[PDB]
Amino acid sequence: MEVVWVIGDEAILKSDVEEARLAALYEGRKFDGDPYCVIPEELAVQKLYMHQAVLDSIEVPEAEVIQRVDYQINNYIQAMGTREKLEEYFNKTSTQIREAMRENARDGLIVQRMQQKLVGDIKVTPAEVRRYFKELPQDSIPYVPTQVEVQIITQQPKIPVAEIEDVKRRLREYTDRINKGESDFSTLALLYSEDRGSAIKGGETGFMGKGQMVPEYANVAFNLQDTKKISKIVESEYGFHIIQLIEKRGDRINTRHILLKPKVSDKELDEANARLDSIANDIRSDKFTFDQAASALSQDKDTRNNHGLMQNPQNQTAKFEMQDLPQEIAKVVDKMNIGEISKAFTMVNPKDGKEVCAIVKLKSRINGHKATITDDYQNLKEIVLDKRREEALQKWIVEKQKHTYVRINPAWQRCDFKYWSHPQFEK
C-alpha cells in the first residue's frame, strides 16, 4: 500500500511523504518528535484546511495568485542574480516556472484565508501580554533586531524618442507585411516578439478573460471584429503590441500578439540617477524637504502619497529589519547615518520587474535591544497573538477530524499523533 493517509476522498501517498521529508532536509528542520509520524500528520492537517475551504467556498482570485507568483519570481531573480541563472537552476523557462508556482501559491493563500476565518477574532490585552512574558525565564526574552525606517524617491529612466520610434517603425512594417501576404503573424512573432511565453506559440496568448489582461490590451483586443485585422499599435506596461484575434469562445478571447520593448541603456540609467542626485542636492540645500520631494516628484505609486515612507509587508508598519529590505536598498542603507540621503542607485522593483532609479533617506535607526512592554509592545503582542491563534487552530483540527472521513495506513499505528488520539486504521 502506497496510501499513507486518507482525508475525505484525497490520499496522501508515500511519495508525498518522501517529498515533504526531503523539503524538511534542505530546510534543515530539526524534529523533537518522530519525523516518520510528524510529517504525514502535517500533510493531513493541510488537507483538512483545504477540505474546510471547499465547504466554506473560500476562493482566491486568480489575480492575487499571479501577483504573488510574480513577486516571488522577482525575489528569485534578485537572489539568483539574473533570470538566466534562475532558469538554469530550476532547469525551466521563466514561464514554465510561473506555471509550476501558481498551484502552490493558490493553495498557500487558500489555507491562509481559511485560517484567518477560523481564528481572526482572537484578541489580546496588554495585561495578557505582560503576563505571558513575566511568566518565563531570563534567557527567553525576545531580542528586537535593529530596525530602520526608510523614505524613497523613484524615477523610471526615460526612453529616447528615437528608440520608441524604432519600435513603432518595426510594428508598422510587421503589420504591413502581414497584411500584404509577405509574412505570417506567427513567423514574425517567433522571430521578433519579446513576450517569450507567447512568442514560441507564434504569439498565441491562449484564452483569457478581460480582467486577466492589462487594460490597454483588453480594450483593444475585445474591439477586434475578425481574425484578419491587426490592431493599431497599443502601449502597455510591458511595451508595444500589435494584436490579432484568434477566437471569441464564451466570455474569454484568444489572441496572438507581437510585443516589442524599447531598450534602456546605461546612458539613460546614468541620466536618471543624475536627475535624482540633483534632487538630493536641492534637499541637502534645504530648497525643499524630502517629504515634499517624494510627494511631488516620486514615481513610486505605493509610497508617494505618504512622503515616500516605505511599508514593510512583514509587520504592516514602516519598521524594517535589514533583511526585510530590497537587497539594493539594504546595501545602501547599511552604510548610512540617520537623516542622510543616498547617492542615486539603480534597482529592480520586485512588484513589476522594472529597472527604476531611486534615492533613499534613512528616517530612523533603532539599534537591537531586548524587548520592553513600554517600547516594543507590538513586537511582544504579535508573539502572544500568534500563540493564541495556534492554540485555536489546534483545537479546531481536533473538532474537524471528528467530522471528516479519515483513514490511516496501519504501518503508522505505533505513532503518537498530535491531533488524532484513536484514528481508524483501514486504508
Binding site: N75, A79, K85, Y89
Partner: protein, 76 residues
C-alpha cells in the same frame, strides 16, 4: 579533487575543491562559477547542514561524492 553539487530540480555541477577548503569557501567557488550569492547558499552533506566555519575534511567529504544545494528564499 572534485565533488558534485546537486539541487532537487535537474541541476548539477562539478566543483574543484580540497579537503582543507572551508565551507564558506566552497560557497565562494560556486559564486565564482555560477554567480549565486554565498550568504544565501545552503549546503548539505549526509543530511547535515554544513557550518560555514568548518572544512570538507571536518564533514568527511569524499571525492566524487554529492553535496546538496538550495538557496535561501528561493527553494529553502
Amino acid at each position: 579533487m572534485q565533488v558534485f553539487i546537486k539541487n532537487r530540480y535537474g541541476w548539477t555541477i562539478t566543483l574543484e575543491v580540497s579537503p582543507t577548503d572551508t565551507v564558506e569557501n566552497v560557497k565562494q567557488k560556486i559564486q565564482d562559477k555560477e554567480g549565486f550569492p554565498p550568504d544565501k547558499i545552503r549546503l548539505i552533506y549526509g543530511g547535515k547542514q554544513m557550518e560555514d566555519g568548518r572544512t570538507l575534511a571536518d564533514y568527511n567529504v569524499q571525492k566524487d561524492s554529492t553535496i546538496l544545494i538550495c538557496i535561501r528564499d528561493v527553494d529553502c
